[PDB]
Structures are given as C-alpha cells and as structure tokens.
Amino acid sequence: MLFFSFFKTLVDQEVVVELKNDIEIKGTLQSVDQFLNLKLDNISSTDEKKYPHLGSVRNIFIRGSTVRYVYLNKNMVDTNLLQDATRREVM
Amino acid sequence: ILPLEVIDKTINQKVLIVLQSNREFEGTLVGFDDFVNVILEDAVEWLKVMQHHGRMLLSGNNIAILVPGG
Amino acid sequence: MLPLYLLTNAKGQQMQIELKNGEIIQGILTNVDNWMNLTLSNVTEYSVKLNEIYIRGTFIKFIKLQDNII
C-alpha cells in the first residue's frame, strides 16, 4: 500500500496520464483506489493525436491496469520520504 | 482417477509440455508441485528447436497441457 | 445494484454472452459463482446447439441480459 498512499498525497494536483494505447490525458488528480484506479477532473489534451474521441467530457475514471506512466512535478513529491518508505518495504 | 496422479505417475518418463503460447517442451519429468511448476531433464524446446542439458524449472503459469510420452 | 448480485438473481433468464474471441453463446442461466463463471442450459453457440455449457468468467466481454430485468 505504498503507492496507494503516495497517490493520495497527490489529490488536487495536475498530473499527466499515459495509457498502453499511448493515449495521453492531462488533468486534476481527483481520487485514487487500492488497485490504483484514478479519476481525473477538468481533463485536457497535451497531444492532438494522443487524445481520444471524447466529447466535452470533464471527468473520467481510468483503470489502474491500463496505465503506463503518470507524469509528475518534482515539486509534488518529497523523494526523501519516498526512499525511506521504499526501504521499509516487506514482501 | 485424478489428473494430479497421472502427472505424478509420469515422473521419470518422457513428458510433453504444451504452453498456452505456441511453444512446447519434451523431456523427462523429474518432479512437480501443487502449482504445476514442472522440473524437466534434457529438455527439447520447440516453437524452432533447442536442446537443453540438465534440469530445467518450467514455469507453471503457462502450462496448458501435459502429455505422457509426447 | 451490484453486477454479481444482479447476475445471480437472473437465474432462469435467457441471455447472450460474448467471449473474448468474438464468439456468441446463447441460452438460459442455470448457475453463477463469485468469479462470474456460469453454466447455461438450452445453449446455442455462434462464431451449434448444446444441452449445457460452462464459461470461465475471465473469458467474458459482455452479457446481453433480458430487457425485462427489473
């Protein structure tokens, strides 16, 4: 449950999400679940070809399983805390 | 009869192991577990053919069919 | 209501299942478990008639249910 909590710290932030289909959507991190499912509000297209065929849609659910990257801003993370946390792992 | 006995009774005999992907292995069944991770000896991998020497642990995830003899 | 709960309360109802490979199973629901594995009776199978069929949940895309399902 590390990456769960990490993501819960990013609520209300601007994040870009890349899927396996290469789809890329920018938007505000509204919610995350255990499986790492995200719901982004006020969504926008970084790339014209990367964007999908969605009408005037503002709000989406994205399945955890279909994500490749979530892009972040170094400002939005204490990487110190992240490494201490990663150390405290346990299989 | 159980399937998990037939598998066991093929221990130390020629076995065919067909994976879900179009790839199979023939070798002597050395042993297996409850997840069907098979141990094969002198395994002949097909696809297009490779000859293995020794004990191979073949992952039980991709195992689809087991064939005594092959 | 919850998909699983709705599915179980639909026993006896005729329904249409599409599998991952594009295939179409059609018949009446006689059983479901928690992984949405289902057995069906009075089955017809499109790309063939069958008394009963078993489907693994994970191999299902979607399930046309009966319009009168409320």
Partner: protein
C-alpha cells in the same frame, strides 16, 4: 457449478486460454477442474495427442461434442 460426472467417458470440447481447442474423452477430473482426456485432438490445424492432462487454471469453456 458444473458436475463433470455427467460428462465422464463422453467426448467433450474444451477451449483453453491461449487460443487452443482440445477435443477428447473425459476420463477423470478434480475440483480445480483439471481434466484427464483420452483420444485427445488439439487444434491451433490439428494433431492427435494421446492421453493428456489439461490445466483448469487455463480452462475457459467446456461443452459436449
């Protein structure tokens, strides 16, 4: 939910996760739905494997033939 008992010594048709059809006579099973099949024919065209054990983990559909 499926009583394999009524399929015993009958010719059954099983599709497997991976795009692999298998037709044989059911000779035995268990609750994990691991099957023993004889006079097995597998399809990708076709080849006749002898007596086989099928893994229920990768099992996907099951019917009569």
């Amino acid at each position: 939910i499926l009583d394999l008992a009524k399929y015993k010594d009958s010719k059954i048709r099983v599709k497997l996760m991976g795009g692999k059809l298998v037709i044989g006579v059911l000779k035995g099973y268990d609750q994990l739905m691991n099957l023993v099949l004889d006079d097995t024919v597998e399809y990708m065209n076709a080849r006749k494997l002898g007596l086989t054990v099928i893994r229920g983990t990768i099992l996907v559909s099951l019917s009569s033939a």
